[PDB]
Amino acid sequence: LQRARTILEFEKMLPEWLRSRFRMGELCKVADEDFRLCLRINEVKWTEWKTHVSFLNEDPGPIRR
Amino acid sequence: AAKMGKAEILKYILSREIKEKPLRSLSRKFTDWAYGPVSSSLYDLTNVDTTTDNSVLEIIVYNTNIDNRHEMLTLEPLHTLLHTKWKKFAKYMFFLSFCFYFFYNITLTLVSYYR
Amino acid sequence: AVLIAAGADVNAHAKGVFFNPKYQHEGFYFGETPLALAACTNQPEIVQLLMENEQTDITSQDSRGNNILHALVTVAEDFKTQNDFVKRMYDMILLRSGNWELETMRNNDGLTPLQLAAKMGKAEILKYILSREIKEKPLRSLSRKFTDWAYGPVSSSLYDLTNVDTTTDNSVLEIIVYNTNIDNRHEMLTLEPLHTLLHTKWKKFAKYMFFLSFCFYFFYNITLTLVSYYRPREDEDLPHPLALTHKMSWLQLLGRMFVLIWATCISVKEGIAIFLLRPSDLQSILSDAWFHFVFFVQAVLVILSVFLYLFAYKEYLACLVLAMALGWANMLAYTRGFQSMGMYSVMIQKVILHDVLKFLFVYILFLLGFGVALASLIEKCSKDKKDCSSYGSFSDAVLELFKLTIGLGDLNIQQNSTYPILFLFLLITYVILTFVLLLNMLIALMGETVENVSKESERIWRLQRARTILEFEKMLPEWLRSRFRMGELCKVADEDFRLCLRINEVKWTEWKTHVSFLNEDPGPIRR
Amino acid sequence: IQKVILHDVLKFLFVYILFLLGFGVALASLIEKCSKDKKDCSSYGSFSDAVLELFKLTIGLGDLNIQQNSTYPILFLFLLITYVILTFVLLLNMLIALMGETVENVSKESERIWR
Ligand code: NA
Ligand code: NA
Secondary structure (H helix, E strand, O other), X not given: OOOHHHHHHHOOOOOOOOOOXXXXXXXXXXXXXXXXXXXXXXXXXXXXXXXXXXXXOOOOOOOOO | OOOOOOOHHHHHHHHOOOOOHHHHXXXXXXXXXXXXXXXXXXXXXXXXXXXXXXXXXXXXXXXXXXXXXXXXXXXXXHHHHHHHHHHHHHHHHXXXXXXXXXXXXXXXXXXXXXX | OHXXXXXXXXXXXXXXXXXXXXXXXXXXXXXXXXXHHHHHOOOHHHHXXXXXXXXXXXXXXXXXXXXXXXXXXXXXXXXXXXXXXXXXXXXXHHHHOXXXXXXHOOOOOOOOHHHHHHHHOOOHHHHHHHHOOOOOHHHHHHOOEOOOOOOOOOOEEOEOOOOXXXXXXXXXXXHHHHOOOOOOHHHHOOOHHHHHHHHHHHHHHHHHHHHHHHHHHHHHHHHHHHOOOOOOOOOOOOOXXXXXXXOXXXXXXXXXXXXXXXXXXXXXXXXXXXXXXXXXXXXXXOOOOHHHHHHHXXXXXXXXXXXXXXXXXXXXXXXXXXXXXXXXXXHHOOOOOOOHHHHHOXXXXXXXXXXXXXXXXXXXXXXXXXXXXXXXXXXXXXXXXXXXXXXXXXXXXXXXXXXXXXXXXXXXXXXXXXOHHHHHXXXXXXXXXXXXXXXXXXXXXXXXXXXXXXXXXXXXXXXXXXXXXXXXXXXXXXXXOOOOOEOOOOOOOOOOOOOOEOOEEOXXXXXXXXXXXXXXXXXXXXX | OOOHHHHOHHHHHHHHHHHHHHHHHHXXXXXXXXXXXXXXXXXXXXXXXXXXXXXXXXXXXXXXXXXXXXXXXXXHHHHHHHHHHHOOOOOOHHHHHHHHHHOOOOOOOHHHHHO
8 A cells, every 4th residue: 555655656657658558458348339448458267167258259368460 | 335334245246257158248357368277367457447537456554444345356357557667667766766766865874974 | 068079189289478477467378288177177078088199199398398286286375365276186187197207207498397396486286296195006116205104003115315415416405495486495395205204314413413513613712712802912113924933842833734724614615505596685694695705704714814914914803703703603604403492593593684674773772863963962062071172072972972871970061151951852752763772672572583483593503504414415415324325225116126115104083994005014124 | 480490491491591692702802901990010901801791791780881891892881781682681581581481381281280
């Protein structure tokens, strides 16, 4: 918490155009039209094996090419 | 959920995996690709980081009145995002503020002891 | 099974930018054979399906030279974060079709899959690989364990020991002891063929080669002590670092050539020992190569005193006195052989790293910080005892304030200047800061760690005497007459009488009829 | 009181004597100096004086002096602050933490041993 109190203070006292992008920007959600709402990436591990129904891409790990 | 301090409803609101496909639009979570036990999750982040006014990271950090702030920053879109914002601009802006202040007190020290 | 009967390729090796290093990046190194991710992703029914197919290869290597078994070793991580099917997927694939040929196979970088359990640090698969009791008699040949005789609750076990002890190159005891990169070394030496074998190798040659190295070094520092306290001095500024006595009564001639030989021999031995392993700046230079480093600092520091005699510096006594104080403090290394002092020598080693090193950075910041403030008041043109020839600088305000932690004498708040209810204020600020707050942190902080470390301080000590036995055995270039083992005792085969063995014991529970046995119930050798 | 003269201070007194004797000879090899301590013709300043001036640093001594002594007194001051860091703040404070672990381990069965 105590280093969380400083990061939101330095980011508030940084009046640039905020070039530092922390996030995947404008990556697609599941819709025919709604391509918005910039995103984040994390990882999962071993248990609870199941067939995977909902997915976004045809199994790459990074961006394709 | 943030300002009242209700932690258990806030663990649900950030993930909210929706299995059924006709209404997967309203989820805050998407499995990008799986291939087995190494799947790449993806959180929504539309009202979380300080990019608008009064976002849910700015409430839960700056707040009084709650004894449950330090536990609620364990949650997943709030946890990795503080790691990223530390990684690319805070680590310098903290160590430069250290260097601007460690060099400050030496200049106050030498002028009031030596001469 | 439709696609298998259709005629798909069962042996297709998928290369690419998976098996990426950094598991976080895309990453699923599983071997790349189609048999492997059947076994790797916990699919036991389809493991049976691929093994029934006669077209399926089992022996086929991969991009890293790895077979089926090298891949299945390097995915386990724990018992906790898995159902532990890797132990039974390992067993299902050997018995289904297996000779020794699939086990002995080395990979691209020349590494047995037994050794791959060691260097990767997979502990749970390594408990299985050393025992591996095989019940069914047509394939008891591939076991690493044999019940010799039972007679009830006192049965005599027997471990295989074919690639374990340092009798070949790069054996699984030599990996797991000398290794960095793992936090799981001290737990893995609890396992049975690794545990009793260190007890045997300690019993017959290490106990002497450790206590003789103690006697060769305790008698060393006394000869360095007496020559630099009793007779350095004769009347002039003649340097004379190690006394000679060219005249009769051969004592200092014998004493000088005693030190200069043993200082060189302890330098060349450690100078090759430190030029074997590369630490990384912390945590590996501080645990395994610390007393390799402390001896080497002492050894160069003694032979440097000879070159202080070369053309007569001023440092011939001031350097050699540092070798004496450090020469007694590293005697605390050689009390590693004892048991009860062994646990004490890790709870003194860990708390100079964990609790007082955090302390000395905080305490110096208060020592220096209040140090300048009292020094800025002390000047006063009245400073301390007629300040014309006397003192009263900054360091005097450190020596009058470092002495407030221990007994000083009289704490004076007298003749000093402009506002002595500020000079009295910063003094009682300092005693409240570090006499009653910041020193008494340390007893409470040490009290938390020594009940956190001394639940596993024993096994860390077992590692530290394991680091010495494999060093003395490596520095013993004889023909190794000391036999630690039953030699060439028979395995269960018509022809294969080889693979020298080991003996251990079992006790009361789980009563059963004894099927597999080697002899008709003797306890020792017959006759 | 009977078990901790066997279990904790007996490990202590072997380690502390090794630092008492070990730094004892090193300060004794510097103290001689032909200036040793208060007109060294009839007076003293042998090895045991460098033990009595250094056994007294555990308890109250009087004045710790770093004065008139010889060739490099930023080594004589260095070994003194080496000793106080070794046994005033490290090796004595082991013992309270070590005793604190045993008397909650023995005093669950200290009654029956008394019986
Ligand atoms: Na305590
Ligand atoms: Na005192």
